[PDB]
């Protein structure tokens, strides 16, 4: 047990829940893991895989991101802040990707899933880039049920950190696609109280949050400090009570502990 792992264990004990953390330091390719091989419900953090899968399609279909997609009343689900603005109209796949990633729009996510041929098309892209752990089983909004022990719509912190590294810092995507994903993540609007809240305010962050039942509160992030190699940080948190409140503060505290031990 390292110093950082003892503090993360203390944070978890103080929280009442179950915490999963994976850090990759790309300077020396070292890793910090806390419950790094346990499964956690992804919730909206799975939207990165779906957006990346559509970006991968656009490497062959070069104008794909410009393709209009109808938004119909039947498409609306539980949380659709951007798509509701375009019902009975269209959004492009670029606009749907940005809405899914930067506003956590669940209707937008369902349009990405449909473009990929169902949840199996998202999982397929994960396997194609070497992620053997990720599984997407359902569409929105039921993929956020986050039931303890349910393997559906889960991954592990170790696997998600490696995948996020390959998609953003690595070259699992083409050059313009990789840059587009980074731009989208940097422009996220839902992460101010999560990993970002625990990091020095001068560091540049791109991130995607997730939330669900059982007070499931997640965030995955690529971090660019000034003057050193970037980091990839995954923080997953879930709780014993189905109706538990969100705990974004736990993710901020985990990020702060990781930034300390660095």
Q: Which residues are annotated as a binding site for Zn(2+)?
A: 140, 144
Residue with Cβ nearer ligand CAZ (32 or 108): 108
For residue 210, the minimal CB distance to ligand CAZ (Å) is 4
Q: What value, to the nearest 5°, has the Cα angle with vertex 119 and ends 117 and 120?
A: 75
Binding site residue list: 140, 144
For residue 248, the minimal CB distance to ligand CAZ (Å) is 8
For residue 208, the minimal CB distance to ligand CAZ (Å) is 7
Q: How far is CA 248 from the centre of its chain?
A: 14
Residue with Cβ nearer ligand CAZ (45 or 58): 45
For residue 199, the minimal CB distance to ligand CAZ (Å) is 18
Residue with Cβ nearer ligand CAZ (42 or 167): 42
For residue 253, the minimal CB distance to ligand CAZ (Å) is 17
Q: How far apart are CA 50 and CA 107, in angstroms?
A: 13
For residue 240, the minimal CB distance to ligand CAZ (Å) is 16
Provide the token pair at 94: 């670029």
Summarize as ranges the residues that interact with ligand CAZ (CB under 6 A): 43-44, 78-79, 104, 106, 141-142, 144-145, 190, 209-213
Residue with Cβ nearer ligand CAZ (103 or 224): 103
Residue with Cβ nearer ligand CAZ (4 or 195): 195
Sequence-distant contacts of 167-173: CB under 8 A, at least 24 apart: 167/48, 167/52, 167/129, 168/206, 168/222, 168/232, 169/26, 169/222, 169/230, 169/232, 172/52, 172/56, 172/129, 173/52, 173/55, 173/56, 173/59
Dihedral sign from CA coordinates of 58, 61, 67, 69: negative
Cβ contacts of residue 230 below 8 Å, gap of 6+? 26, 169, 222, 223, 224
Query: Phi and psi dihedrals of 83, rounded to 5?
Result: -65, -35
Overall residue count recorded for the chain in this entry? 262
CB 61: neighbour CB atoms within 10 A? Answer: 11
Q: How far apart are CA 141 and CA 241, in angstroms?
A: 19
For residue 141, say if its preceding peptide bond is cis, omega within 30 degrees of 0. yes
Residue with Cβ nearer ligand CAZ (44 or 157): 44
């Amino acid at each position: 047990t390292s110093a950082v792992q003892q503090k993360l264990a203390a944070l978890e004990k103080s929280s009442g829940g179950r915490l999963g953390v994976a850090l990759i330091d790309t300077a020396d390719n070292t890793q910090v893991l806390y419950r790094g091989d346990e499964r956690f419900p992804m919730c909206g953090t799975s939207k990165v895989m779906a957006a990346a899968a559509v970006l991968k399609q656009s490497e062959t279909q070069k104008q794909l991101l410009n393709q209009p997609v109808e938004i119909k009343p039947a498409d609306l689900v539980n949380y659709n802040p951007i798509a509701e603005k375009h019902v009975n109209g269209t959004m492009t796949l670029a606009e749907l990707s940005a809405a899914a990633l930067q506003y956590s729009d669940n209707t937008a996510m369902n349009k990405l899933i449909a473009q990929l041929g169902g949840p199996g098309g998202v999982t397929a892209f994960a396997r194609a880039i070497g992620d053997e752990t990720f599984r997407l089983d359902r569409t929105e909004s039921t993929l956020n049920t986050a039931i303890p022990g349910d393997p559906r719509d889960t991954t592990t912190p170790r696997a998600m950190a490696q995948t996020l590294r390959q998609l953003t810092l690595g070259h699992a995507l083409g050059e313009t696609q990789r840059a587009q994903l980074v731009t989208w993540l940097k422009g996220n609007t839902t992460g101010a109280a999560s990993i970002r809240a625990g990091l020095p305010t001068s560091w540049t962050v791109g991130d995607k949050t997730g939330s669900g039942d059982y007070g499931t509160t997640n965030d995955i992030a690529v971090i660019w400090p000034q003057g050193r190699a970037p980091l990839v940080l995954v923080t997953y948190f879930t709780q014993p009570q189905q109706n538990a409140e969100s705990r974004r503060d736990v993710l901020a505290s985990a990020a702060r502990i990781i930034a300390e031990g660095l």
